[PDB]
Symmetry: D2
Subunit: 321 residues, 4 copies
């Protein structure tokens, strides 16, 4: 997984979902009056509306990522072995499951400071959705038009990090990912000078020599460094449309193609989908492994509204046969 933010003509938030199969992902709109039920807390019948990507099960929106009507976003990314959910209920804290976490925050919070105050006081409980859909360890990026935070709930407690670069992947923990950037300080967007030695006449026979050292593999640390470099150095766009186009290019630099990353099961990890939310305009844009054409749905009831993903390449054919 890779999640990023971008500040341009509007303000954006999005992710690659990286997995060795598809859940049959869809656009899910949760209107204001869809009743959010909680395993261990009281229902909320009136809340902020959400748009995002996930699956519906038992008429519950299982968000992979989403935004709300105020342009606050939240994404769950794989965090195997580091996530620690409590086996105890707290009498003085909201006892919230991981699958309830996106609704709990995006339903009630208009910005990152409100999200942070609510997250500080949460008890994330170790309770699975169902036998079919068991828990797996996550961590979260939470973003608004101004800034982003990382939430990692581990054995040492609820950690909230200011995220100065608006980047997140998988393991390790965020301080380790941020520390890992320090050894790449020498990378550049332009042909560097010969600091190796002015006693040898080193030749440059192409462009891009300044990036040499940037890791190119799809390990989480490599994707965290490559996404950071690509995002922080990406050219400014003239329009919102150029920004969205640029955002999918940034997610592309860390995309996983089928065949380069074979999991323990022997299945191929790949970028199932990519998305870009325009936070200011509350619009979801997405692509899938199978379809390059961007698809847009805007957030404008007590029932979920769903649009299933097209998993076929939609080609503009100029001529037949």
């Amino acid at each position: 997984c890779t999640a990023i933010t971008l500040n341009g003509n509007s303000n954006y938030f999005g992710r690659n979902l990286d997995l060795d199969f598809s859940y049959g992902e869809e656009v899910i709109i949760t209107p204001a009056e869809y009743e959010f039920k909680f395993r261990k807390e009281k229902a909320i019948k009136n809340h902020k509306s959400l748009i995002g990507v996930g699956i519906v099960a038992n008429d519950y929106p299982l968000y992979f990522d989403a935004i709300n009507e105020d342009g606050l976003g939240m994404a769950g990314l794989n965090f195997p072995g580091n996530a620690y959910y409590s086996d105890a209920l707290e009498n003085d804290k909201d006892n919230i499951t991981p699958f309830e976490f996106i609704p709990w925050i995006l339903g009630q919070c208009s910005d990152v400071n409100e999200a942070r105050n609510l997250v500080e006081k949460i008890n994330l409980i170790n309770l699975s959705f169902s036998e079919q859909l068991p828990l797996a360890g996550l961590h979260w990026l939470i973003a608004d038009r101004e800034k982003s935070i990382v939430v990692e709930v581990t054995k040492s407690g609820v950690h909230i990090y200011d995220n100065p670069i608006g980047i997140l992947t998988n393991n390790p923990e965020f301080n380790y990912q941020m520390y890992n950037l320090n050894k790449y300080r020498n990378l550049s967007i332009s042909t560097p000078q010969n600091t190796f030695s002015d006693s040898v006449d080193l030749k440059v026979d192409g462009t891009g020599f300044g990036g040499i050292g940037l890791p190119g593999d799809v390990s989480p640390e490599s994707r965290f460094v490559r996404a950071t470099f690509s995002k922080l150095n990406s050219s400014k766009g003239m329009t919102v449309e150029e920004d969205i186009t640029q955002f999918f290019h940034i997610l592309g630099t860390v995309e996983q193609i089928k065949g380069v990353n074979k999991t323990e099961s022997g299945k191929e990890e790949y970028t199932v989908y990519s998305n870009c939310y325009d936070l200011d305009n509350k619009t979801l844009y997405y692509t899938t492994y199978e379809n390059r054409q961007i698809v847009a749905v805007t957030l404008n009831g007590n029932r979920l509204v769903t649009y299933p993903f097209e998993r076929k390449q939609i080609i503009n054919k100029l001529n037949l046969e």
Copy 2:
């Protein structure tokens, strides 16, 4: 630039064009009876038809890359400083300009063996198209449904290589690009064993550790390595559409986004377009920096036929 081939349900050939500006390139179809004129050789009045990408100047198709009706493809890629074009004509050679080279081969040859035979008799001469379009240094990938060759014309002469992997980028020369792969033999698609030492407990907290050491930057040698790793390991598709999708993902692994590669001039190098030719079906598929949605035109008079590129993002709004 990066050019690749792929063998799947059908057989493919295509490239990224990486530059700091667009030339206003378009689809050009050159029909059988468009007359090819050469600066130092007899005109060809009747030839194979071409579909490709480039510009039309003075009613002449300046191809960046193209295929013919037989499914033979040819791409010119930047080769600055190494390309050497002769000021001298040779009476025992075909004297051909670099900009005439795609027409000369694709007009006349049905396959790579025929291409190699014609290249073996060539003398690439130092005459520019015009004062406004001077020669730049190029090398070529020539591919059919079965195999590919690289043509590099340098000070030491006309070099033709068998391309065992179907990959080409820019400098250096092909024997250096191929030799450069050897130090990456240890890379893997899978989590490796701890060979570092049995005496320390090294842990894996994520997938993709096998690839650690693959280069990520957009230098030509890094892109040669990354394209090769991505292409040779890419999963087989079950249909031609799955193959075209997979092809565009492979070119995506070595795409240049605006901002990460700033030239001597201070302009941003970027992937202007990406294309995939289906050689067996004679169909061109392409994308542009500005438009993710693939456009297709199939090769099915004596005048150039053109289809301008649309550089606007075509978004499906539900």
Copy 3:
């Protein structure tokens, strides 16, 4: 700085000292009845005798590293910015200065277990030796013939780590150094198989291809990785002499030569000295940048006065 342990025919502990300048360091033996004075604790008049390397100031042994008569070793290595020394006394603790730490542990402890029990009760306090000799940020490797620990005293408190590989350099903190090893699991001492793709005939035209990916620079994390690789894979010696030989080869893999590492002052950081303590035989072996020949000194252990041997800083060449 790089500090290592090695287990062979005997058991060894030692370090590179990497600095911009020599500090006039020399061999210092502290005998059993040299009185150890502490700023905030009772003097120790009878203790284990020490042999190590450091400077003498106002008749006090300021050790860079040392062992005791029981073969317990301790080294202080640079840890700038991360080291945090307390401005206050702490209640149920021994209040010990950083310059007193080596005397405090090696004077009283015979093994790592005892060292750990003592460090658990310690508070390192922000008092300098003198105006001319202010405190620098350090962390410590403590080693015996069996095992080693790391001590890092930071803002979050006194941390003690089991050191499963017997390696320490500088920054970052020990959990970061250890985690950083994980990305190198694929390195090998032998020619690897082509796992890149069996669709391309990759050729091997020399030995050492298994190591490709091992970092070669003298940053502290690169030295941590390269020392770990060299030490864990180093061939076993047949004799104690072969072990000592090997130990100096291992420190050599992460030596800093003059010219490759230029500090902010313009001065080059370099390996001032390398040492190997034979813990079982209580013998200090050392080399200097200037002199390749190993010098040996054995633990002068009775008495009450510091005994010192200055470093030979000339190349001692066998002319036939």
Copy 4:
């Protein structure tokens, strides 16, 4: 193997011998009137005196490396599969065996210019010293106080390269090794500026960050890069003693310790010996894997004078 030159207060040449066993190497002085016999050329009764390292078989000095009385040095380094020795005699060339090569050059030449003239008319012939000492592929560094050349005799003939850096290891061929330096131009001896991005506050918590990217392994290409970086940046000494000390520190950067490099035989490759010749003072300095103490012998007869290497650690016990 790694061979280097260094220019300081005097001028130096020397090498690491990297192998998985010892031949019982020794110092060999060949006097002026030891008769050099050649399998296919006229004997040389009077020549320049030699001091070097190697073995003596059948009263013949088999040098691994040596200098002569004029301060001209030559070293043979492993070059497996690339070295090609001729199965033909050439009437217009000197037909010299690989094991005669060092005597042929150092015996007759007073500097690298002269060496180049003689190599331009050599034919290295496929003729072994004996059944027990068969030919292995070599290439050569030839060095004087001013400059150095590399000789690689391959399938495509006798190649001679100016060596602008005074470094040699093993494979690949010299143009490939020099080309491979170009991707390291960004390395530095000082803490670099944050060029990665202004928008993130990257921290430096130690010294040596400028070298990040330098390869640390003992592959021939990694040793070439590392030796080059270490030698071109090494600090000047104010004395000859400080130069010799520095020289052993530079070779130490690319030394092979027992255990990190296992040959196809499963034996450990290690730096058997390191040497430093003072070319101006005609003095050999050497260390062995087993003895850190530097040993000196000066070049000051019909007979080889030889001193075995001590392979015991000579420790100063106070």
